[PDB]
Structure 1
Amino acid sequence: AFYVEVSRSDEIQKARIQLPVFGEEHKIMEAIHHNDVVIICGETGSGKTTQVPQFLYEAGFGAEDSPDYPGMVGITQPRRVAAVSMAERVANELGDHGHKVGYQIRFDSTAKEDTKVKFMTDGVLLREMMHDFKLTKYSSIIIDEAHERNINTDILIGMLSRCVRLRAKLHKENPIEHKKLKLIIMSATLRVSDFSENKTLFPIAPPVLQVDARQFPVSIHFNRRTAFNYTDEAFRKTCKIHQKLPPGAILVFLTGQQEITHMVKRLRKEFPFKEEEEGFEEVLTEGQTANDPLYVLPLYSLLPTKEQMRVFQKPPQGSRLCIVATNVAETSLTIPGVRYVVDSGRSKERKYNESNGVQSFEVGWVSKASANQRSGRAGRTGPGHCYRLYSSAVFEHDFEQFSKPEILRMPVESIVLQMKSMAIHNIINFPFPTPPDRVALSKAIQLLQYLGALDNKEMITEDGKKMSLFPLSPRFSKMLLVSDEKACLPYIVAIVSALSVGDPFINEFELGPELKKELRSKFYKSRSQFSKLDKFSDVFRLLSVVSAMDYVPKEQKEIFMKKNFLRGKLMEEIVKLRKQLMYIIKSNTSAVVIRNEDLKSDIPSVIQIKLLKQMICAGFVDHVAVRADVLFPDDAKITNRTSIINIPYIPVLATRTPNIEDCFVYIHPTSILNNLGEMPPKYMLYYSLHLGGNNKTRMNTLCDIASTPLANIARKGLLLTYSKPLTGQGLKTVNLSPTERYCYVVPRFGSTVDNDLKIGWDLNPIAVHQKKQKGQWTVIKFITRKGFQTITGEE
């Protein structure tokens, strides 16, 4: 009721007083009492994850005798293992009340009667809000690890902002029947402005509580210049610190495991056991040399627990601890005695942009906020130093102020489909902590209707639910749904994995003197080995290389990448994704274990590659470009002599301008299409459009598509209108009743002749089966020339 008396052992209680959050109990509880929403900032090691549910439990949260907080305390974690290990920790810590702690890591499981403090995943809470949005079961909700900005955590916070508001309104109407809901958002960092200062999320700003003790100052040292070889500059800087500066451990921030492993051994080999620069004014203390040993250790998420745990050990006497890490060391447990940070200023992050034609997983500059978080790592135990391996001008102009959340680095239609499967109806006005653009949101809902994932009322369909089962862009999930025809499924999973991961082919990002011409000969010979399936499709060049990979032995892999100018990491990743999709497909046809041998396939037949282009079309129906001379010959200025990269194309649904040349897109010089001795295809399917270096928009081409296959896909994809029945020789309308007919129509793809400020075009005349439904003729199916001839013969 008022308070709950918990009995803990002296060992357990003394361990709790040591935690930085322990003394913050009264400030935290004063904020919760006066505010329905509270934001708590404290690093990992502060104890806020394990202590705040206990502070609530002790104040009467979850107590049946409580007139205010009878409901449970719910705590989300972004990972299943974190929720279980956290529940285990708090159960021990709560002593004689330890039986009141539980976890939920499945939707299936029903909680135990004594569970009053429940640790779960975001997914479990999201599912619970589908069954009961009000979450009447809870008195409180703690959203931990909110600085990660995971897409489902952001949706959950958005949903909860509305839930807390409604719980507040119902409580004001009837405090007996309706209880308050306490929302606590937790962050390892101070970067909470997208939660605290967002008025759509929180109209009245919630208090932000700082639980950490104050840090020590850190002197920031920029380099005069920004070195291209940053691992070389990082190695150089690390050695200079070790050889010249007083005691204190070193922390190096690199981008990945291979850079780490290479530097770790380069440093171990440099300091083994038995002009003018900033930040080198300090000298070595007595009993310290320039050639002392360096105890080097790697630090990355993939390392085994026993290897990760070594970063906390004191280095051997007479040596210096040097940690070589990725951004895991940005918000991890405090590595003791660090007074030197070597910052490369970069990280490998997945980027994706709308209207910009961006899709990358690569090394780029980090935000100013991440650079500062890296810097502050040197001032945890005492005043430290940070060595930035870039200039202050590059920092100021090339580093963005803030790090981009996941919701802005992932396809907008993936976010919309995920929300729609959760029965979140109004997307346009959803209170996102960081909202995607309204135009992009509107475009994502329309795309989903073209893919059949949402119906005419914008509700999730049966196909949309199946597509939501894959960790893929709905374009790719659509392709999978239509692929199980004439055994094309293994080919589509291969294409979809390759397109999803990125382009493994290295192009003339190298040489396009005598040695340069010699390498182009090997380049083109390699490129032509994967161009054998179709002469128009860059997508089957991907299928060929991915299919070749499966027949290459593990030892020979590296030379296979070298001979063929291939991104090895990308090829390994495609094999990983194909196995993950194969696991999902097989697991939905009822334990499943996919091996490298299950991925091996034979060459697709002529019928199969025709069908695959149509399956690609289903996922990319709004991404068709017509050869400009079929629409605007005078403006196109295409001769039989024009080069392939100079022949313009017009994307369907492109917005018209006074000058049609504004709508022109062109074949990329790296495309298979450049080897054509003929006029390129009338209709081309494209992955994406890129605003090129020569100021020309270039198509990232997939494959060609013929008129009738495009018509079939555009009919199901709702991008077709038809003309009135055609009149002509052997074209005559055959009426089965005044409500049923078979006739020839001209299909209109995309946009009508009348609506000429958006690009559309006519397809080849086609035989059609039509039924007069609600006073208007509707196309039931397309008919072949032979099919039509038999119907005209039957009548």
Structure 2
Amino acid sequence: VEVSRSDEIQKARIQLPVFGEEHKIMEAIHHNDVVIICGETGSGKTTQVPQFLYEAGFGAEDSPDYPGMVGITQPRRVAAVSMAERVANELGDHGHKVGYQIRFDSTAKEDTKVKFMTDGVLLREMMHDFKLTKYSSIIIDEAHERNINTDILIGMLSRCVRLRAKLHKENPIEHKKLKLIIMSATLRVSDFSENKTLFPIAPPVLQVDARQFPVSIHFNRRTAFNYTDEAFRKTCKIHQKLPPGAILVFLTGQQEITHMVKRLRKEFPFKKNANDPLYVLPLYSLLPTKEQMRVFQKPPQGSRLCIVATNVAETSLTIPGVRYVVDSGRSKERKYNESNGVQSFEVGWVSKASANQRSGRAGRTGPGHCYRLYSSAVFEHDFEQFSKPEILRM
């Protein structure tokens, strides 16, 4: 199968170190019933999978009615949409042959081989069905967050695939076996691979690296009673001491963030061409789009960037021209008193996965200086390494 590619996007095909590993994906699409592949983002996994499975012999495997076509599920609607104006142009075919579906935009075209999903739309489709005949190649995204809907869907697809791992008809050879790879976002999914519950077999796994684009991890053995002022001091020390760039100041809630915005408008009130060139912007997804496009833009000249954000920045929104974080130390979380029906908004330990993703959010392609207001001994006491499931709270 050929793709009708383009020049700069063939530059985007070869550059990824997973396309040369295509044969593994080939055996992963030909040998194993369920495959688990992990890796940090930016290593060319979602931006390389449609070129795998459009060229795998699965677009027309069980042809001529097209029941072999890949659905790749995404954490959220904007991830699928942005990735569709990213890599549906990577396969050189129009919107009929590559597409997406989100909560309120359905692009159900019959020519399609690659479809980017959320969780809920595919739930909608296979409570509308139960045996998943129209699909044969499925790729999962974000296996490390372990949300509600990802876990729900993976349990019920384990049921459906292991029901179709059996014989389709009265002992045929034409089985509607479903080929599925979980393209993870961070490199610990083995907490599910050890179990014999969701699959009694051990699911075969593949581990791939990424491009670090280095970040310097720095621990401050400091009291973290008012982590706002500590983050303020670390970002002032980077802004004055270290070479220029952009620095991230991270917090938890609604009020400390605008308090830090007021302060960085106070001690650095100039923002035009105390000659510290600085533009300071808050960020969380409870802000309107005009401020959300204000951070999409680059800083005005005579001013660097500095972003006072909550814990949104790890996964929700990420911006190009930043270098360094000062972490939250402790992040805001929510839990329910099941003995009462009492909810809660509180602040507790950042797990090491969220902090690592945060440090990666700092050093996109440039140097990172992860000035952590907490210590290594406090990073010793940020167990567990990964975050706890979002199921257990609600």
Same fold (TM over 0.5): yes
Residue 157 of structure 1 deviates from its aligned partner by: 0.6
Partner in structure 1 of residue 75 of structure 2 = 78
Residue 178 of structure 1 deviates from its aligned partner by: 0.8
Residue 264 of structure 1 deviates from its aligned partner by: 2.6
Residues 1:381 and 1:68: Cα distance change in structure 2 (over 3 Å): same
User: Is the Cα contact below 8 Å between 2:215 and 2:360 reproduced in 1?
Assistant: yes
User: Is the Cα contact below 8 Å between 1:298 and 1:325 reproduced in 2?
Assistant: yes
User: Is the Cα contact below 8 Å between 1:41 and 1:189 reproduced in 2?
Assistant: yes
Q: Aligned equivalents of 1:340 and 1:89: distance in 2?
A: 26
Residue 160 of structure 1 deviates from its aligned partner by: 1.5
Q: Aligned equivalents of 1:6 and 1:306: distance in 2?
A: 39
Return the match for 2:213 from 212, 216, 227: 216
Q: Aligned equivalents of 2:315 and 2:124: distance in 1?
A: 29
Residue 221 of structure 1 deviates from its aligned partner by: 3.0
Q: Deviations over 1:682-734 (max 9, x none)?
A: xxxxxxxxxxxxxxxxxxxxxxxxxxxxxxxxxxxxxxxxxxxxxxxxxxxxx
1:375 aligns with 2:341: no
Residue 55 of structure 1 deviates from its aligned partner by: 1.9
Q: Deviations over 1:595-614 (max 9, x none)?
A: xxxxxxxxxxxxxxxxxxxx
Q: Deviations over 1:721-749 (max 9, x none)?
A: xxxxxxxxxxxxxxxxxxxxxxxxxxxxx
Residues 1:384 and 1:56: Cα distance change in structure 2 (over 3 Å): same
**Structure 1, unpaired ranges of 5+:** 275-287, 407-793
Partner in structure 1 of residue 124 of structure 2 = 127
Q: Which has the higher contact order (CA 8 A, sep 6+)?
A: 2
Residues 1:325 and 1:63: Cα distance change in structure 2 (over 3 Å): same
Residues 1:98 and 1:55: Cα distance change in structure 2 (over 3 Å): farther
Q: Aligned equivalents of 1:399 and 1:69: distance in 2?
A: 47
Q: Aligned equivalents of 2:104 and 2:226: distance in 1?
A: 48
Aligned partner of residue 153 in structure 1, secondary structure: helix
Residues 1:353 and 1:34: Cα distance change in structure 2 (over 3 Å): farther
Residue 273 of structure 1 deviates from its aligned partner by: 3.8
How high is the TM-score relative to the length of structure 1? 0.43
User: Is the Cα contact below 8 Å between 2:144 and 2:189 reproduced in 1?
Assistant: yes
Residue 127 of structure 1 deviates from its aligned partner by: 3.6
Q: Deviations over 1:443-498 (max 9, x none)?
A: xxxxxxxxxxxxxxxxxxxxxxxxxxxxxxxxxxxxxxxxxxxxxxxxxxxxxxxx
Q: Aligned equivalents of 1:72 and 1:326: distance in 2?
A: 39
Residues 1:219 and 1:81: Cα distance change in structure 2 (over 3 Å): closer
User: Is the Cα contact below 8 Å between 1:61 and 1:70 reproduced in 2?
Assistant: no
Residues 1:382 and 1:118: Cα distance change in structure 2 (over 3 Å): closer
Residues 1:48 and 1:108: Cα distance change in structure 2 (over 3 Å): closer
Q: Aligned equivalents of 1:147 and 1:116: distance in 2?
A: 26
Residues 1:87 and 1:303: Cα distance change in structure 2 (over 3 Å): same
Q: Deviations over 1:495-521 (max 9, x none)?
A: xxxxxxxxxxxxxxxxxxxxxxxxxxx
Q: Aligned equivalents of 2:103 and 2:328: distance in 1?
A: 40
Residue 63 of structure 1 deviates from its aligned partner by: 1.2
Residues 1:405 and 1:100: Cα distance change in structure 2 (over 3 Å): same
User: Is the Cα contact below 8 Å between 1:61 and 1:71 reproduced in 2?
Assistant: yes
User: Is the Cα contact below 8 Å between 2:350 and 2:382 reproduced in 1?
Assistant: no
Residue 200 of structure 1 deviates from its aligned partner by: 1.0
User: Is the Cα contact below 8 Å between 2:42 and 2:211 reproduced in 1?
Assistant: no
How high is the TM-score relative to the length of structure 2? 0.81
Q: Deviations over 1:627-658 (max 9, x none)?
A: xxxxxxxxxxxxxxxxxxxxxxxxxxxxxxxx
User: Is the Cα contact below 8 Å between 2:273 and 2:301 reproduced in 1?
Assistant: no
Residue 147 of structure 1 deviates from its aligned partner by: 3.0
Q: Deviations over 1:86-108 (max 9, x none)?
A: 45655443334642234444699
Residue 317 of structure 1 deviates from its aligned partner by: 5.8
Residues 1:106 and 1:348: Cα distance change in structure 2 (over 3 Å): closer
Aligned partner of residue 93 in structure 2, secondary structure: helix
Aligned partner of residue 334 in structure 1, secondary structure: coil
Q: Aligned equivalents of 1:27 and 1:309: distance in 2?
A: 41
Q: Aligned equivalents of 1:31 and 1:192: distance in 2?
A: 17
**Structure 2, unpaired ranges of 5+:** none
Residue 376 of structure 1 deviates from its aligned partner by: 4.1
Residue 181 of structure 1 deviates from its aligned partner by: 1.0
Residue 41 of structure 1 deviates from its aligned partner by: 3.0
Residues 1:32 and 1:270: Cα distance change in structure 2 (over 3 Å): farther
Q: Aligned equivalents of 1:245 and 1:340: distance in 2?
A: 10
Q: Percentage identity across aligned positions?
A: 99
Residues 1:33 and 1:77: Cα distance change in structure 2 (over 3 Å): same
User: Is the Cα contact below 8 Å between 1:63 and 1:71 reproduced in 2?
Assistant: yes
Residues 1:30 and 1:382: Cα distance change in structure 2 (over 3 Å): farther
Residue 189 of structure 1 deviates from its aligned partner by: 1.9
Q: Deviations over 1:545-575 (max 9, x none)?
A: xxxxxxxxxxxxxxxxxxxxxxxxxxxxxxx
Number of residue pairs the alignment of both structures matches:
392
Q: Rg: which structure is higher?
A: 1
Q: Deviations over 1:337-373 (max 9, x none)?
A: 6443211212222212545986312222222332333
Partner in structure 2 of residue 384 of structure 1 = 368
Residue 154 of structure 1 deviates from its aligned partner by: 0.6
Residues 1:93 and 1:377: Cα distance change in structure 2 (over 3 Å): closer
Residues 1:71 and 1:303: Cα distance change in structure 2 (over 3 Å): same
User: Is the Cα contact below 8 Å between 2:222 and 2:375 reproduced in 1?
Assistant: yes
Residue 153 of structure 1 deviates from its aligned partner by: 1.6
Aligned partner of residue 230 in structure 2, secondary structure: helix
Q: Aligned equivalents of 1:398 and 1:355: distance in 2?
A: 27
Q: Deviations over 1:66-88 (max 9, x none)?
A: 59985222222343454455456
Residue 224 of structure 1 deviates from its aligned partner by: 2.9
Residue 140 of structure 1 deviates from its aligned partner by: 1.2
Residues 1:32 and 1:175: Cα distance change in structure 2 (over 3 Å): farther
User: Is the Cα contact below 8 Å between 2:41 and 2:210 reproduced in 1?
Assistant: no
Q: Aligned equivalents of 2:192 and 2:120: distance in 1?
A: 20
The root-mean-square deviation of aligned C-alpha atoms, in Å, is 5.5
Residues 1:35 and 1:304: Cα distance change in structure 2 (over 3 Å): farther
Q: Aligned equivalents of 2:172 and 2:3: distance in 1?
A: 28
Aligned partner of residue 195 in structure 1, secondary structure: helix
